[PDB]
Amino acid sequence: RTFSYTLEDHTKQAFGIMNELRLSQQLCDVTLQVKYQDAPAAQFMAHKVVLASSSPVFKAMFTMEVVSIEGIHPKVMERLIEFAYTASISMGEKCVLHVMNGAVMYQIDSVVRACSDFLVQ
Amino acid sequence: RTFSYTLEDHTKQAFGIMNELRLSQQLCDVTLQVKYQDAPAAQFMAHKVVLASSSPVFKAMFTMEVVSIEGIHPKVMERLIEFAYTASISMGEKCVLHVMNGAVMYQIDSVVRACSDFLVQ
Ligand SMILES: *[C@H]1C(C#N)=C(O)[C@@H](C)[C@@H]2CCc3c(nn(C)c3-c3cccnc3)[C@@]12C
Ligand SMILES: *[C@H]1C(C#N)=C(O)[C@@H](C)[C@@H]2CCc3c(nn(C)c3-c3cccnc3)[C@@]12C
């Protein structure tokens, strides 16, 4: 007989740690430079393999690097990265469209579907 | 008002992709050399930030590198890495103790508790 076991919460817990690591800027191997049209330049350190696992666009991009990002607002990028590491996203209603546009841009389909479904209303 | 959304399955899905990436040997930044006492040398490519998020011992170790691993059996290491990326682990009963010893060695407490609870019986 062969024993087997699954920890139901493991993925949620491992992501918690991965988020700590990003916040401590530990083990990061990418820096996203978001320069965008009158808004101040922002930088976001992250882990390539985590970004790739949430976005086909990031996966395509990566399969210490500094990446220039045009065409998306830093605050929008910030929220998408948070989603990549936390499985949740928040914005103030008067902006759920801007977020959606970022999520469309990065093929984060679950976020797109969420904003879209909410915007319809 | 501020909108918020959580994708319940995101962590399970992102890990699925991270596992694909490891299997395709994409974005890896560590190679674990497991040489152990009469057994053949084995190598395991992985992502530091994923190993770190499942093991305090790996986190301590990392906070393309080749790491020499002594004192643990390659097949045991293999199963622990699988657990790190899949949240599940399997072995053939006549070996759940060997696995437990590896899991103890790497402070993967949920695996230790699982084998321990099963061994008691
Ligand atoms: C509006 C908002 C709210 N409420 C947010 O929660 C965040 C997510 C938005 C970031 C992007 C943004 C916002 N307000 N504006 C006017 C923009 C913007 C500006 C220029 C180009 N694209 C977007 C926020 C702050
Ligand atoms: C026994 C086993 C079963 N059934 C497994 O599923 C895997 C996880 C074991 C790997 C380690 C191992 C096993 N059998 N032996 C004798 C060892 C071993 C040998 C020497 C030192 N430590 C462990 C497996 C194959």
Side-chain angles (χ1 to χ4, degrees), chain A residues 2-121, chain B residues 2-121:
Chain A
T2 66
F3 182 54
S4 190
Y5 161 88
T6 297
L7 176 61
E8 214 54 58
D9 289 299
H10 171 72
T11 67
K12 325 209 176 197
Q13 280 145 30
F15 260 86
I17 293 164
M18 282 170 186
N19 199 26
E20 280 167 24
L21 288 175
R22 165 183 73 93
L23 295 177
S24 307
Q25 297 172 208
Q26 295 256 245
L27 295 171
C28 296
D29 44 43
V30 73
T31 298
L32 304 185
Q33 271 183 357
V34 191
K35 315 202 175 182
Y36 173 87
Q37 198 192 78
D38 286 351
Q43 286 181 18
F44 305 94
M45 284 177 74
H47 310 89
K48 284 178 173 182
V49 67
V50 179
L51 293 179
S53 74
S54 74
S55 166
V57 175
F58 277 130
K59 191 181 175 176
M61 281 177 67
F62 304 129
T63 46
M64 168 67 66
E65 168 162 316
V66 180
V67 186
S68 276
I69 277 86
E70 314 268 311
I72 187 174
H73 191 258
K75 200 159 182 188
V76 178
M77 186 72 264
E78 192 184 59
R79 297 285 192 271
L80 300 175
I81 296 163
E82 273 168 1
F83 174 85
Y85 282 80
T86 69
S88 95
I89 196 159
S90 65
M91 62 296 216
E93 181 191 300
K94 68 171 185 280
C95 283
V96 321
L97 173 73
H98 288 113
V99 166
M100 177 183 181
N101 294 339
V104 164
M105 192 183 315
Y106 282 83
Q107 292 185 55
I108 304 164
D109 300 315
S110 53
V111 176
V112 177
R113 192 170 300 113
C115 310
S116 162
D117 289 340
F118 167 72
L119 282 177
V120 178
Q121 270 134 51
Chain B
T2 66
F3 182 54
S4 190
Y5 161 88
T6 297
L7 176 61
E8 214 54 58
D9 289 299
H10 171 72
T11 67
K12 325 209 176 197
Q13 280 145 30
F15 260 86
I17 293 164
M18 282 170 186
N19 199 26
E20 280 167 24
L21 288 175
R22 165 183 73 93
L23 295 177
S24 307
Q25 297 172 208
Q26 295 256 245
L27 295 171
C28 296
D29 44 43
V30 73
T31 298
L32 304 185
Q33 271 183 357
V34 191
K35 315 202 175 182
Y36 173 87
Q37 198 192 78
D38 286 351
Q43 286 181 18
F44 305 94
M45 284 177 74
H47 310 89
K48 284 178 173 182
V49 67
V50 179
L51 293 179
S53 74
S54 74
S55 166
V57 175
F58 277 130
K59 191 181 175 176
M61 281 177 67
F62 304 129
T63 46
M64 168 67 66
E65 168 162 316
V66 180
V67 186
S68 276
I69 277 86
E70 314 268 311
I72 187 174
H73 191 258
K75 200 159 182 188
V76 178
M77 186 72 264
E78 192 184 59
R79 297 285 192 271
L80 300 175
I81 296 163
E82 273 168 1
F83 174 85
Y85 282 80
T86 69
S88 95
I89 196 159
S90 65
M91 62 296 216
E93 181 191 300
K94 68 171 185 280
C95 283
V96 321
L97 173 73
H98 288 113
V99 166
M100 177 183 181
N101 294 339
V104 164
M105 192 183 315
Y106 282 83
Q107 292 185 55
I108 304 164
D109 300 315
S110 53
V111 176
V112 177
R113 192 170 300 113
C115 310
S116 162
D117 289 340
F118 167 72
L119 282 177
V120 178
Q121 270 134 51

